[PDB]
């Protein structure tokens, strides 16, 4: 008889459950192309979880019950008792997230399921399973999703023919910045404009530089370069009129990195100074205390979302001091 399409949009969000909503309170998407490929779902015919003439409240209670199970608990139930169903891209009831060339979007997986648009008699239980082997740090927080048809479109009054689901994956990133100051031999000092930095990390005893490639998943791309200053692949960060050297839209995950000065400010130019970035792997320690990014060992104030505020700019910290008086 009749079918509907369930479309999973698997994306990655940064922290600071309605699976049908692409907006998530307490979270924000990592980029416009932050879809997550390689995620896998099993989809079960869950019509036997329904009863005839059940109320909307009973359906919501059932949906909530399954959403509040862990994936492993829901799999224990579904694997034992239900059958795979729906035409997925990996098989009956089997979905893998891939790029959608039509929509131009990553993290997409579509499944066609038999539905009853006139009464709630068909339902599908969707549960994420292990991703394709290959982002170990990603928090895959999707829940068991019980999709009960029909889902009526309030605008149109029609049953929805496509259900869009936005299962939540959370990527941990932080946002380094610092201020470059210049110190005159007479003790005067100022914010420095025009310092050109790049970011590198160490891998196998060699430098890899943060490149200009679009972010995919939570991952930045890193390049070996012969000439980071003039290599267009290497992202440069320029100190502005407030002295601010800001990763800006760029973010970094946990680990150790370096801001490398590629062009010093005239008069404040000895191998190229490397300012250490130490990014802890969580916002908070065991006791809920903030864990700071360290810039050359200095704690760096930071807000969720990573935007450097006017108040942070006024503060001008952390600051790295460049001496005009060469000694
Ligand atoms: Na849940
Ligand atoms: Na940033
Ligand atoms: Na400082």
Distance (angstroms) between ligand 2 centre and the Cα of 230 equals 22
Tell me if residue 38 falls in helix, strand or coil: coil
Reported resolution, Å? 1.5
Element (H, E) at 314: helix 310-315
Distance (angstroms) between ligand 3 centre and the Cα of 318 equals 4
d(CA 312, CA 300): 10
PDB experimental method: X-ray
Do the strands 255-263 and 189-191 form a parallel or antiparallel pair, or are they unpaired? unpaired
By residue count, the chain amounts to 327
Two structure tokens written together for 188: 């005067």
Do the strands 162-165 and 3-9 form a parallel or antiparallel pair, or are they unpaired? parallel
Beta-ladder partners of 238 = 196
- In the 8-state DSSP scheme, what is residue 273? P
The answer for residues whose C-beta is within 8 angstroms of residue 191's C-beta and 6 or more apart is 179, 180, 181, 182, 239, 241, 242, 243, 316
d(CA 2, CA 137): 41
Tell me if residue 122 falls in helix, strand or coil: strand
Could you tell me if 150 and 170 are in contact, meaning their C-beta atoms sit under 8 angstroms apart?
no
Phi, psi of 67 (to 5 degrees): -60, -30
d(CA 74, CA 63): 12
d(CA 151, CA 59): 11
* In the block, residue with structure tokens 């309030």: 154
Do the strands 244-246 and 122-129 form a parallel or antiparallel pair, or are they unpaired? unpaired
Distance (angstroms) between ligand 2 centre and the Cα of 215 equals 13
List the one residue out of 16, 8, 11 whose CA is nearest residue 43.
8
Tell me if residue 68 falls in helix, strand or coil: coil
CA-CA distances (angstroms) from residue 23 to 39, 42, 118, 148?
20, 24, 29, 21
* Nearest ligand to the CA atom of 64: 1
* Nearest ligand to the CA atom of 249: 2
d(CA 252, CA 107): 21
């Amino acid at each position: 008889d009749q079918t509907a399409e369930i479309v999973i949009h698997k994306r990655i969000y940064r922290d600071i459950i309605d699976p049908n909503n692409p907006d998530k309170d307490g979270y924000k998407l990592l980029s416009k192309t932050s879809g997550l490929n390689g995620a896998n779902f099993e989809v079960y015919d869950a019509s036997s979880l329904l009863k005839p003439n059940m109320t909307p409240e009973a359906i919501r209670a059932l949906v909530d019950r399954y959403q509040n199970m862990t994936r492993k608990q829901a799999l224990k139930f579904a694997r034992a008792n239900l059958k795979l169903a729906g035409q997925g891209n990996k098989g009956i009831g089997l979905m893998n997230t891939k790029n959608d060339p039509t929509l131009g979007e990553d993290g997409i997986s579509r499944i066609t399921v038999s539905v009853d648009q006139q009464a709630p008699t068909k339902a599908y239980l969707m549960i994420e399973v292990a991703p394709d082997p290959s982002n170990v740090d990603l928090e895959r927080k999707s829940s068991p999703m019980l999709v009960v048809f029909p889902v009526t479109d309030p605008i149109s009054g029609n049953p929805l023919q496509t259900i869009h689901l936005y299962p939540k994956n959370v990527g941990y990133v932080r946002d380094p910045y610092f201020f470059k100051f210049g110190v005159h031999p007479d003790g005067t000092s100022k914010r420095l404009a025009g310092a050109i930095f790049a970011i590198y990390r160490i891998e196998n005893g060699k430098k890899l530089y943060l490149d200009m490639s679009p972010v995919t998943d939570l991952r930045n791309k890193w390049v070996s370069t012969t000439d980071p200053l003039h290599d267009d692949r290497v992202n440069k960060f320029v100190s502005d009129q407030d002295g601010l050297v800001n990763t800006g839209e760029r973010f970094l995950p946990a680990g150790e990195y370096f801001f490398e000065e590629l062009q010093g400010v005239p008069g404040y130019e000895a191998k190229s100074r490397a300012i250490k970035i130490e990014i802890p792997d969580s916002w908070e320690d065991e006791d809920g205390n903030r864990r700071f990014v360290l810039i050359d060992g200095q704690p760096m104030q930071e807000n969720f979302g990573g935007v450097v505020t006017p108040e942070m700019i006024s503060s001008g910290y952390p600051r790295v001091y460049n001496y005009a008086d060469k000694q």
